[PDB]
Amino acid sequence: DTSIDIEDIKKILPHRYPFLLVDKVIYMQPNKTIIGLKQVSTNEPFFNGHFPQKQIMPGVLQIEALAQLAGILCLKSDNNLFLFAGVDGVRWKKPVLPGDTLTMQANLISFKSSLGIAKLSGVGYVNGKVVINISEMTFALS
Amino acid sequence: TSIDIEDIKKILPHRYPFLLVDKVIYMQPNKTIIGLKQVSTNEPFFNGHFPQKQIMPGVLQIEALAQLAGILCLKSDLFAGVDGVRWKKPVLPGDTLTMQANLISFKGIAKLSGVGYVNGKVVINISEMTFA
């Protein structure tokens, strides 16, 4: 099964409202990869600010949802406070909108027990099509 | 020139809780912009990041620098890409985040560099923000 619900995600991650952006893990293979989703609703606090005349999920929150999914995989592969240390090669392909399901996959590149550093790639999809690519997210365990 | 929040809001469409530039200190069109974001415990995202340790999310530091870059673009006349982001040290309640963005290219695509400081010391670097 490998899927994880929100209550169990909360036991893994320190993040809470209004900055928890993984609704469900649908698949995970420890030390390899993880797939989850974020459901995108008009009823989310950020939408009033981004933007009044046109609701578009901020691209940086799409990085954040990929980062959080990625951090689930790291914690379940091996301090639950991981900070963003670097990110490279983010390309946003298409706007994410209220009504969408943001499906996300993060793949582990490296994880150093010793140093508390992890690197992963990430891709986000809507309706089977890429809306975001991230070449490399780096996390340090503060 | 310098720009206060009401004038910032006349340039940017961003509103609460996603307007992350509190002041523009200096702006030279087609060149550079310096501004700041004040970091308070009384911001909505801190309850979530994290309950037991309040740390300004790195991704919101990208966004603040991207919004600052957006102003310089609009006044030299979405977020398509970002690359070479490095966070050096956590930004905490009670800090002032001072930011500078430099225009690298305007070709229909604009590319800018970004730097964030807390007390003179770099807290974030962005080699490239890409807009169109």
Ligand SMILES: C[As](C)(=O)[O-]
């Ligand atoms: C997903 As994070 C680097 O804001 O804990």
Ligand SMILES: C[As](C)(=O)[O-]
């Ligand atoms: C970086 As933006 C498109 O939220 O101004």
Ligand SMILES: [Cl-]
């Ligand atoms: Cl955006």
Ligand SMILES: [Cl-]
């Ligand atoms: Cl962070």
